[PDB]
Amino acid sequence: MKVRPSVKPICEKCKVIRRKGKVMVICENPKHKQKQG
Amino acid sequence: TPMANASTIERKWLVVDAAGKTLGRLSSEVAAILRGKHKPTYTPHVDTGDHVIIINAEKIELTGKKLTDKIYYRHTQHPGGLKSRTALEMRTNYPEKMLELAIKGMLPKGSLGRQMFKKLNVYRGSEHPHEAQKPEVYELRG
Amino acid sequence: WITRINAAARMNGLSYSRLMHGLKLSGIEVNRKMLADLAVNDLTAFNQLADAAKAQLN
Amino acid sequence: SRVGKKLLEIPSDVTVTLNDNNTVAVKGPKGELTRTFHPDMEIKVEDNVLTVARPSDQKEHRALHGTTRSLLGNMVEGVSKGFERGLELVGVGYRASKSGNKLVLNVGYSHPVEIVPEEGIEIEVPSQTKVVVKGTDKERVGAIAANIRAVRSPEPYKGKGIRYEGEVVRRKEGK
């Protein structure tokens, strides 16, 4: 769970979605999930 | 020399239904009829206003996401203490608070302001305690 | 005077601004705010001016 | 490539009823389901046919059109044949047993736990190491499955607690 203002898909099977106005990224690797801000 | 009326006034009793009128527009028009600015013989120091009664204070609706976004701050005079409650809060128990401070901020400030807020009463439901004043139903315009 | 005139116009279902606009294209209404206010205290005459302005407006 | 466009069916005595304001009540062999919808959707029931349409073509309209289509499908299918979600608890001492309507599940916690389904949602314990819930609607089925999972979601080293059917859990090597 990273909290970075810059959100990148770390690997190709991460996918970027928007929840509650804040951009997340979800991947089945739990090491790759972060929110923006 | 125009007539500045004093103690030549009759007070009407008005009923307005608040179930489907947003409190911003409702407060804005209710402040005007509380001022008596609808009355033609208005003077700014004798309170030619009209008694109004709210009906269904419980059913106000709010535009946008104000239902949980509007905060009602209040500050007791003791140090380091602030109280707040949201807009969807006090719908549960006292909408009369939301209305009463809405028209309190609506109408002018001063001794006449207190005396002129004095005429307004606000209740839940659709039931007057009083019918002896022969209250007529009036609708909003804007 | 203006807010009294505004009340007089609104209770005939008219805005004050449209009222004076209609008066001005109705003619040179040299009648002014004080005596229009006295026309409010003689309101039937104020009605007799208001409908003339309204009917002239269109 | 449009799920909200396709049609739905009434196979075997699926009594779909349209109520006053876009409200639907269906009584099938499994039971009765009821649901209320905001009235901008047009739902008309024909013999073995039910309609769904949106007034305009824009974002929220498309979204709620597709969702209400899938949801009507979900209620009619659940009231037709029902739904079940299996669950296979794993480990070395973990014990799950029926205790009437209420379930008693024995986990390494110093106390046994308790779950009381009440919504017409029924549970079945076919084996010691495998449990299943039975319910009319998939939503409440998944809710009860979620609370059973939340008693002990598994660990990534050995794997314990509660597991869904074929649920792949991540493996971490603990030295």
Add this chain to the structure above:
Amino acid sequence: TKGILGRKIGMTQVFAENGDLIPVTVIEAAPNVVLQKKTAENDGYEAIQLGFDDKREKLSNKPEKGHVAKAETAPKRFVKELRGVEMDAYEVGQEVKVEIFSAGEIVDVTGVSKGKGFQGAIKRHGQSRGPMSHGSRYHRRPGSMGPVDPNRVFKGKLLPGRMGGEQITVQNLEIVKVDAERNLLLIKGNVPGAKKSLITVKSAVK
């Protein structure tokens, strides 16, 4: 809930059949009488208000005499009311006595405090005092007012004033013996208030 009202006669110790020593509070309570049964549909809530001990006819006045004449007793000096009681349990004019309590029950106790008067901050709130030596002219003063920027002192800086006389509640007290013959109560602990004063005793809400 349940509770009575009495007069605090004193406090002592009593042994309790095991070797340990138990200080006790001694409260005599003549059997109280319920005078009015406050009900919801007119009073907004349900309660019973009851009187504790008598008065002479000299100090009795006509209004309270008429109020008491419904329950047909002597005039009552000490009247209080309780909330949360069983509404139908008490008929108006009945007594309550002391036996509704039994030894070993946890008890909420409430009484007025001992009045002390105008005491300084040292006694009043127990913050420490300055040095007694090394040049200190700050022997027993109540501390600095506050900062400078707010241009005023805040509310609630704790200053010298009167003590006492303000009712206080001690929770979870334990009744060790009841003497219904003499109409006496005997609670472990220490109970606030001066001698021969008000004291009310309740079943603990905890």
Add this chain to the structure above:
RNA sequence: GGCACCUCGAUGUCGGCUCAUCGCAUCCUGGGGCUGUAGUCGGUCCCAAGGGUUGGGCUGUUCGCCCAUUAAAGCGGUACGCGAGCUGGGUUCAGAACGUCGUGAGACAGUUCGGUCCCUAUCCGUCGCGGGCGCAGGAAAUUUGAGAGGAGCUGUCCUUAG
């Protein structure tokens, strides 16, 4: 630190004592995510300001270092909080000396010993306590509660179970 904008017809300057109060960019206690997280322990990050956040030795010292505890020994703001509340150890007078500089009178963010801290509270403000009046008759009691305050902290041991 830069600028010189209010104050030289005076706005008392370090530190300490008494008293707090606020913010959160959280030291503990609360809830979680990831872990190069087996478990006892941790690392980071997020939500969280309710409460708490120790006694000594040394130096005027804040600061530090050390001793011993604690769950923890937080960071900051409020005229580097608080002298019409206190302290006067140091800087910040007049005496005297040392080192150095100056031919000298003398001088040193160099040191050392000694060295007068005024005020009867007017109005706000604060903490208590009274009198009047009001509450469309006059009284004695019992209350409702808008709305204010306070408390709101934690360890150790046993068992589950080696």
Add this chain to the structure above:
RNA sequence: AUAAGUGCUGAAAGCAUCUAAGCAUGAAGCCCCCCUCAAGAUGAGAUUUCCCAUUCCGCAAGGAAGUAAGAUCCCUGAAAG
């Protein structure tokens, strides 16, 4: 009732997706529950009980003069000061 978080169902965008529609769970945190004050709350609240609506004047606008219930002054005091 929530925060971070964990979700259930599901389209937009045939899949996926705690999400936009809905349904949940979730903190020494918020409101209550605990204790105290509190109707000057001028919005001056409520309950029970007692006194009764006398004498004069302008007759009446309203005053004044004895009172009832009930208080007070004064005195003995303290558990209060």
